[PDB]
UniProtKB/Swiss-Prot annotation:
GO terms for cellular component: cytoplasm; endoplasmic reticulum; extracellular space. Its EC number is 3.2.1.17. The active site is at 35, 52. Belongs to the glycosyl hydrolase 22 family. This is Lysozyme C. Lysozymes have primarily a bacteriolytic function; those in tissues and body fluids are associated with the monocyte-macrophage system and enhance the activity of immunoagents. Has bacteriolytic activity against M.luteus. Disulfide bonds join 6-127, 30-115, 64-80, 76-94. The keyword Cytoplasm does not apply. Residues 1-129 form the C-type lysozyme domain. It comes from Gallus gallus (Chicken). Monomer. GO terms for biological process: cell wall macromolecule catabolic process; defense response to bacterium; defense response to Gram-negative bacterium; defense response to Gram-positive bacterium; killing of cells of another organism. Pfam families: Lys. One of its GO terms (molecular function) is beta-N-acetylglucosaminidase activity.
Length: 129
C-alpha cells in the first residue's frame, strides 16, 4: 500500500506516535517519506547482507527475522514480512521499541539527514487529524 501523506499521518496518530518519546507527528511522517516514499512494500538490501523492510525500513540485523541474516537479532520478535503489510501496526510497535533504545530517531539515517532540524510540522499541514 502506498499511503497518502495525511492518510499516513492519521494512521500514525491513531497508533500513538504523536509526541511518542517527544517526537511530534511530523517527524514520523517525514521519516516515512524519505525512507520508503510511503510504500509499505519497500525493501532495500544493506552491504552487510541485512535487509530493511517496510514504511520505516526496519533492519533485519537487529529487529526482525527474515531467515537470511546470519548472526542477527530479532528484538521486535516478528518476521520481517509482517512489516510489509498494508496495516502499519507491526511497523509502529517495532518503531516504538527502536526509538526508546537510547538514540531516539537518529536510528533512521534519512530522518537524521533530511528531517532533523527542519520544519517537520509542514508534513502534517492541512491534514484533518
Ligand atoms: Cl509526499
Ligand atoms: Cl509535527
Ligand atoms: Cl536470520
Ligand atoms: Cl491500522
Ligand atoms: Cl530523544
Ligand atoms: Na534478524
Amino acid at each position: 500500500k502506498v499511503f497518502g501523506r495525511c492518510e499516513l499521518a492519521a494512521a500514525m496518530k491513531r497508533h500513538g506516535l504523536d509526541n511518542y518519546r517527544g517526537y511530534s507527528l511530523g517527524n514520523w511522517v517525514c521519516a516515512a517519506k524519505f525512507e520508503s516514499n510511503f510504500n509499505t512494500q519497500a525493501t532495500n538490501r544493506n552491504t552487510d547482507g541485512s535487509t530493511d523492510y517496510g514504511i520505516l525500513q526496519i533492519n533485519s540485523r537487529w529487529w526482525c527475522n527474515d531467515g537470511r541474516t546470519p548472526g542477527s537479532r530479532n528484538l521486535c520478535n516478528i518476521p520481517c514480512s509482517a512489516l510489509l503489510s498494508s496495516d502499519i501496526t507491526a511497523s509502529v510497535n517495532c518503531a516504538k521499541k527502536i526509538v526508546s533504545d537510547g538514540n531516539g530517531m537518529n536510528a533512521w539515517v534519512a530522518w537524521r539527514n533530511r528531517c532533523k532540524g527542519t520544519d517537520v510540522q509542514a508534513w502534517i499541514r492541512g491534514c484533518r487529524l
